[PDB]
Ligand binder design. Structure first.
Ligand SMILES: Nc1ncnc2c1ncn2[C@@H]1O[C@H](COP(=O)(O)OP(=O)(O)O)[C@@H](O)[C@H]1O
Ligand SMILES: NC(=[NH2+])NCCC[C@@H](N)C(=O)O
Ligand SMILES: [Mg+2]
Length: 356
């Protein structure tokens, strides 16, 4: 690790301290003991501690603040990753290991809001990393193209309900892109947290989205993770949404080789997405409970749920529509993760109905 990097790190560490109002897990778990312990470490691909915390240093409003430039980083900088992972996922010891993939009994899931007065739409997604390829910050332009080719070709083999087309971002009209994003289908452009983590190099090369004509099954290619496999639709039929996702992931997995870790389960770029990599969500309106975003968030937190704005991560709620989902993804099965969202949303709906 060169002197320049050390300077930026010491300065980075410095800045975090003087940020008396910073509430990121990076700030919380990067003690000087932790800091001095790994600051001189470097991975087999050159990833350094700066590559890990840079996003969190530059964006103090980060909730977490770190990313893994490569798989090795999870262990090389474990002293920082471990406590942050334990904290975020609500309990994941140094000795714990993520359980085997378990979709569970799909028949036990239910309709989330029969009368349809609160829920607008339901979505469940997973993330996957391609074996043979490192995470965004270590990828070259040629690798982005390679991966895009490999994934788009595999998806052309999907059949029946999952049959669809791949739409490259490179060459996509600004109007179409803007629509696909506004419709909540496509990942947005230029996320400051991802950018400062050097995860958006060579954009839009190798980036794109596959989706069936109904746009109920979609696959993001090369955004935050190599792949994001999504199932979504209007309403609250979580059962159908989940089943579609399960069908799609089982199928894609028999065709592509994905990185899985004995301890961390499926590997992803952000520590928040490890394990099941599952984020089950609903776009929902809860007039009484969501009078004050803070009150809604405190309520959601007790059900292990997370609140986001209508356009996703770090956005505001628009028209009273909130994105509420299971916060935890590692240390519990796929079934358990979707159930935390189902259970908490069913109850919050009950609380809203009983609110004055
Ligand atoms: N339940 C949902 N219904 C419709 N759109 C949703 C829903 N949940 C998330 N989204 C959309 O997914 C997109 C990405 O959001 P983000 O918060 O970054 O989630 P992700 O975990 O998939 O990366 C946004 O356009 C967001 O509005
Ligand atoms: N991974 C993800 N999309 N969201 C959670 C982390 C966002 C941002 N780095 C903060 O911290
Ligand atoms: Mg996202």
């Amino acid at each position: 690790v060169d002197q320049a990097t050390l300077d930026k790190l010491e300065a980075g560490f410095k800045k975090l301290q003087e940020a008396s109002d910073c509430k990121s897990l990076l700030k919380k778990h990067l003690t000087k003991d932790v800091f001095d312990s790994i600051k001189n470490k470097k991975t087999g691909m050159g990833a350094t501690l700066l590559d890990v915390i840079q996003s969190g240093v530059e964006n103090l409003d980060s909730g977490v603040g770190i990313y893994a430039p490569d798989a090795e980083s999870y262990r090389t900088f474990g002293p920082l990753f471990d406590p942050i992972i334990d904290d975020y996922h609500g309990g994941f010891k140094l000795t714990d290991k993520h359980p085997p993939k378990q979709w569970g009994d799909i028949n036990t899931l239910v309709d989330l809001d029969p009368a349809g007065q609160f829920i607008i739409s339901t979505r469940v997604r997973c993330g996957r990393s391609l074996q043979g390829y490192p995470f965004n910050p270590c990828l070259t332009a040629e690798q982005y193209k390679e991966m895009e080719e490999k994934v788009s070709s595999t998806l052309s083999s999907m059949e029946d309900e999952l049959k669809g087309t791949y739409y490259p971002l490179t060459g996509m009209s600004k109007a179409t892109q803007q629509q696909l994003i506004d419709d909540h289908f496509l990942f947005k452009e230029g996320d400051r947290f991802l950018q400062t983590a050097n995860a958006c190099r060579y954009w839009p090369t190798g980036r794109g989205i596959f989706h069936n004509d109904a746009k109920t099954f979609l696959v993001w290619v090369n955004e935050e993770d190599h792949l994001r496999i999504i199932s979504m639709q209007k309403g609250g039929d979580l059962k159908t949404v989940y089943k579609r996702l399960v069908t799609a992931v089982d199928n894609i997995e028999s065709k592509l080789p994905f990185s899985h870790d004995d301890r961390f389960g499926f590997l992803t770029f952000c520590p928040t997405n490890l394990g099941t990599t599952m984020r089950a969500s609903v776009h929902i309106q809860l007039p009484k409970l969501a009078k004050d975003r803070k009150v809604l968030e405190d309520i959601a937190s007790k059900f292990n749920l997370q609140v986001r704005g209508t356009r996703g991560d770090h956005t505001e709620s628009e028209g009273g529509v909130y994105d509420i989902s299971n916060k935890r993804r590692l240390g519990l099965t796929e079934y358990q993760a979707v159930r935390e969202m189902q259970d908490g949303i069913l109850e919050m709906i009950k609380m809203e109905k009983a609110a004055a």
